[PDB]
Symmetry: C7
Subunit: 137 residues, 7 copies
């Protein structure tokens, strides 16, 4: 099942990093196996309501705690392929006082790297990039 | 079922890009087939409560993670047909310090492209366009 | 059932546009027919829990994605009949830097149109109109 | 049942406008009748789970769409009887740049009307009045 | 049951106003009686699921509509006994442009009354008092 | 059960005030006894669904109303033991216009007390302390 | 089970502090044991619905109260391994007026420590670090 999940993630391009892809495949396989085991246990007569409630509460806690990380990952997934964000392109992010200017040097799944005029490295989150005005020369 | 979903999406005009329409049709067909299979499994006696809980948690996670993308897509769907946003039209978006000025050159399902006086390309999200004051000369 | 829903919407005045009224009547009729069919299927013994869960998840996704559109529509519904917002009336919306001034020329279910001193057309969303201070000369 | 709901609303003073009171009484009577009918249908054996789910989804959509209207109505209900907000009283609402000054001339369930020094009519929502500093001379 | 609820509220000090205490006691007694009646009806065989769903939806609507009022009441409950907020004490609430200065003259369950240097009466909500920096001379 | 809850709270250090600890122990004992009684009542055949729904709605209302108080209490619990916040230590909280400067004199479970240069007493909520930049000389 | 949870946490690197790891292992073991006991009790016939509802309400209260702490912990987990945040590295966090400048001296699971030009110690929460522009020389 891990191989199937890895192939699915690689084909759809959701995850490109081999380590992250392997970790996500393992997590998904474990979750599916646990769901199948819980269904089988509930079929024969075992009351699975407390287990379902505990699993749901734990999952909700994990999801709500990692909201920023998930949003940044989804923003990186969506922003992939954008023509304005390319290596060597001078872009400006934000409007007003909260403005960021630099040249794109490297792209990551959590941060967007820009090089300022003075040479400083700017780490702009993909979430900030999605919901902001992007100015490209 | 994929053909039916594609025809539905094309007729209602929700999705116009053939690739996005095909992907959405495949996703919808898979979801409907999974729901039907789960209902059939639960009819004969298999306890489908853990499977339903896991599917609901995963769906909630996916929906909450892609909130910005979904909002931008819905904003693009709603804003289609607006007379103020047309090619060659000089429009101004925002009020106060957070203001954006340019001429509409191209429209997308995620970004709105404007050409500044200096020639810079401005990428204004459709979500920003919906909930802001639009000034058209 | 579509005729009944159309008559209901026309009588209560929720929707005045014939196209929007027809679309909403069709959507409501389809939803009611689906609910009745699901209830009938569940009566004879078919496990409708997965179908109910999938329908609820899809409905929640659609509602959360169209939150801004629904809020604007409700704001337009509520603001109808206001004496301050009439054709030819000079009104001012907002306080401080985020201020909008103009004369009302046309009203829509999504935008409020104002004419500035220079002749620019201002598109103020009804949601912005509801939760803001309105100044009328 | 409509008469009972109207008498209840009039006695508790929640709604004072006869038209709004009649509409709310009709809505409440319809909702109670529908709930009773659904309970009776479910008693004899009809599976009412899909109907309950659809009704809950529709109610949640309506509640979330009318959030601003409901909040303003509740704010008007709470603010009734306040000594600072009386006809002919010069009051100031807000702090800093977002400040509003005028004399109270008329009170409504959606807006608070103030007369400026120049004679302009200010429409301050009751929600803005509740969560703001009120200065009364 | 109304007497028991009134005694409970008086002993715990949650509500001190006799009118508010009586209204809350009546509401609580009605809610408990309704819950007991619904449980008794469901025991003999009546399907109480639609009634439970309708009651839950109505309660959620009422709670969400009165969020500001409930928050202000809880803030007043918590802030009671604070040494900095006493009659005749000169206090300052807020930081930066959004600042409020005055002497405490009277305390209420919804507003905090301050007397300015010029003699104006300031109505600061208890919610604003809780989540702000308080400066006491 | 009250003694057990008091010992648990004292050992884990969640609550240090004897009055608050006693009140929380009483509340927890009452809640556990009510849950056990409801389970016993539902075992013999009594339909406990309306009671569970009413208890859940009341608990959700209480939790949502006391959100600020709970957040401040958790912030005080987390911030305990911090080396920067000690008696006699000159600390600065906030960035930009919303800045607070003073020397720590006393610590509470709801407020943080600072002494300004002029001698004024500053009441900074623990929630404000947690999510802000702290500058310590 | 405590040993298994401790080994799991140590291997995945979620928690590195031995005290926090031991506390989390104890909490997880207690939760799993309680869920298993509740399932066993519900299997033999005991109505576990009130217990499940009470446990879910308590868990939701605890999760919502510790939202900031959980978010900071997840931010610290995610930010681990970042090259820009290293000892002796001069970094700048924030844009506009809300800006923070200093050299990284020590890293914690709740705060990020920076040394200013004057020698002051700055405590920047990891949540603030994640959702902000980071400037590294």
């Amino acid at each position: 099942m891990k191989r199937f999940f890895n192939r699915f993630y690689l084909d759809t391009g959701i995850i490109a990093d081999p380590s992250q892809r392997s970790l996500a495949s393992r997590v998904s396989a474990f979750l599916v196996q646990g769901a199948v085991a819980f269904s089988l246990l509930g079929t024969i007569g075992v009351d699975t309501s407390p287990l379902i409630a505990a699993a749901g509460v734990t999952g909700a806690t994990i999801v709500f705690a990692c909201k920023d990380f998930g949003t940044n990952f989804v923003a990186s997934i969506v922003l992939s392929g954008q023509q304005s964000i390319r290596t060597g392109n001078l872009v400006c992010i934000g409007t007003g006082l909260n403005v960021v200017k630099g040249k794109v040097v490297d792209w990551d799944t959590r941060y967007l790297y820009l090089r300022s005029s003075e040479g400083h490295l700017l780490h702009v989150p993909n979430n900030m990039v999605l919901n902001s005005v992007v100015t490209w020369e």
